[PDB]
Structure 1
Amino acid sequence: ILGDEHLLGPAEYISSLPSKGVREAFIDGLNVWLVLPDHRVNQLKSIAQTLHNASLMLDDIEDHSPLRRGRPSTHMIFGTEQTINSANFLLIDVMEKVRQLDDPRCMDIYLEEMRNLFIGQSFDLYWTRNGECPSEEQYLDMIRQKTGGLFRLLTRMMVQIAPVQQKGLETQLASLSDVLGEFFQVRDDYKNLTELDECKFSYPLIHALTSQPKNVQLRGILQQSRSAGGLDVPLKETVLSHLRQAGSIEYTEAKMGELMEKITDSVVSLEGET
């Protein structure tokens, strides 16, 4: 009838797994600049945790990943439909917490940044389904919304409840959020490749396909993955060998270095201001 045990089951499962906690560390780091009450910071951390959990729950069915952190995924314990149902309700649940922050403007930020996140994820899903390689500009504009969406969403809701005074620090913090969202995705791509199964594009894999327009081997191992469903170890070694010859990994290291210089410059400028 009404027990609400089949709704929060999947939500509670994913919320009891090991996690890095980068989203909460970002809030803690920002709270130094914007002095805020512990109550508000904890509310924002809960919001970020719920949004992250919903995103993780959804992005596992769309990747057919049986395991998460060595533990089984949520849809392998509850079912795909139940996981979708709980994830679509976590959006409503967060909607009641943004409304408890006592600010009419906080709902506008929520409703705009969520739309940006959904646009980015929609583009990622399209490029995954239809194997169309995007340009570097396109890929860098997706991950500034798909991954930098949560950081920007948290930042804009925190400079609004920030006590008076500091209001000028809006553009700088937003740029920091975007650069961090870019860095945290290039880093994950580099880590995953140097140390693709679901035929997912990455920054190193676009450079290879762009610099080498006549590489017919790469474009065929990229299609065997789509057709069969995944690449075995012998084919993954071939893909890594093809990427090692185009200088894609060096390109990725250069991009990461360039991004980190921007991060440190923004941090030093912000520290100078405050």
Structure 2
Amino acid sequence: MNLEKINELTAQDMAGVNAAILEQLNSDVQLINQLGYYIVSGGGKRIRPMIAVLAARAVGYEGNAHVTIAALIEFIHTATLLHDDVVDESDMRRGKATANAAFGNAASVLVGDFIYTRAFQMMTSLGSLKVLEVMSEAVNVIAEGEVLQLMNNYMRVIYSKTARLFEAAAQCSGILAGCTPEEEKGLQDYGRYLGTAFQLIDDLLDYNAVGDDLNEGKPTLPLLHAMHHGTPEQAQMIRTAIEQGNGRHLLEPVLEAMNACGSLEWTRQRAEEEADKAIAALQVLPDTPWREALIGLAHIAV
């Protein structure tokens, strides 16, 4: 299945997920709603929620509570973006100025706490202690990972950073609809694998398909492959740039190093094998359009 067939299949729900989000920017404190609208109305992508809504429909759910969990997951994602931009001192989040550049760090961090606690209130309103423990652990696991990276297998770094919230989204959505243990492990895995592939792609896309990863010598897979399989000269450069935590102005020779050792595609067929495990793990679920839709997002990812 492809994009528009999914944008239309899931059109009604996602519209509700969208109203559910904006509905909670309720504060009497205007700065909260301002900064909120500013960041959630910048395009986004809505995959995590789309995965949430799909996971539910795929297991027979016919209610509208999956619309609320998908919405709170987006708020969570939103909150980590707000804090990440303050931490990474970013002034650009594709297109416009980050919330911090436009509102200030304080507001950005404080509004993200509002948004995160509100999502938490939304979960408690769902009354499932299991969804609460799964979700609270994933977010904490993310938070801890970010602290580690701050004071310093890179598949461990992205699992925590990205894959884990995907895992939670699909799984918790399943628990909420009242899925089966086999359907829960299935959905949970789809999320973990699609999340890993989502991130791998992302890192490979930072190298102009921006440029931030190298600028600060991030140990991404694309960069790590080039190092090992390139010339000792290209290899030395990449290595010191990482030890230096700075690869500014080293983009061209770096590319040449990749476009020669096939590091940029050795990374795509790494996310391609993760996207696979994802579609496989969905064997369990009942053959519904909702599933072939999930199967869709998997292929589209890479």
> Do the structures match in fold with TM over 0.5?
yes
Counterpart of 1:231 in structure 2 is: 248
Larger relative contact order, structure 1 or 2 (CA cutoff 8 Å, min sep 6): 2
The equivalent position to 1:217 in structure 2, one of 237, 242, 245, is: 237
Deviation at 1:54, TM superposition (A): 0.6
Q: Which amino acid aligns with 1:205?
A: L
Whether 2:210 is the aligned partner of 1:192: answer no
Distance of 2:272 and 2:169 partners within structure 1? 25
Residues 186-220 of structure 1: per-residue CA shift (max 9 Å, x gap):
11111221522333221111223345695322234
Whether 2:204 is the aligned partner of 1:204: answer no
Residues 68-89 of structure 1: per-residue CA shift (max 9 Å, x gap):
2211110111101211111122
Unaligned residue ranges in structure 2 (runs of 5+): 1-26, 292-302
Counterpart of 2:187 in structure 1 is: 173
- SS of 1:107 mapped into structure 2: helix
Question: In 2, are the aligned partners of 1:11 and 1:53 still within 8 Å (CA)?
Answer: no
Distance of 1:250 and 1:109 partners within structure 2? 34
- SS of 2:30 mapped into structure 1: coil
Counterpart of 1:41 in structure 2 is: 66
Aligned length: 257
Distance of 1:183 and 1:15 partners within structure 2? 24
Deviation at 1:123, TM superposition (A): 3.1
- SS of 1:270 mapped into structure 2: coil
Give the TM-score normalised by the residue count of structure 1: 0.82
Distance of 1:92 and 1:250 partners within structure 2? 40
Distance of 1:34 and 1:171 partners within structure 2? 13
Give the TM-score normalised by the residue count of structure 2: 0.75
Distance of 2:125 and 2:238 partners within structure 1? 52
Question: In 2, are the aligned partners of 1:151 and 1:181 still within 8 Å (CA)?
Answer: yes
Distance of 2:240 and 2:76 partners within structure 1? 37
Q: Which runs of 4+ in 1 moved over 6 A?
A: none
Distance of 2:240 and 2:45 partners within structure 1? 36
Alignment of 1:1-274 (within 5 A): 3-126=28-151, 130=152, 137=153, 139-163=154-178, 166-195=180-209, 196=213, 197-211=215-229, 214=232, 215-222=235-242, 226=246, 231-232=248-249, 235-271=250-286
Measured at CA, do residues 96 and 213 of structure 1 come closer, stay the same or move farther in structure 2, by a change above 3 Å? farther
Q: Which amino acid aligns with 2:74?
A: Q
- SS of 1:251 mapped into structure 2: coil
- SS of 2:108 mapped into structure 1: helix
CA RMSD in angstroms, aligned pairs only: 2.6
Deviation at 1:122, TM superposition (A): 2.6
Distance of 2:231 and 2:140 partners within structure 1? 35
Distance of 2:190 and 2:149 partners within structure 1? 23
Distance of 2:191 and 2:72 partners within structure 1? 17
Distance of 2:262 and 2:164 partners within structure 1? 30
After TM superposition, the structure 1 stretch with the greater mean CA deviation from structure 2, 71-80 or 38-47, is: 38-47
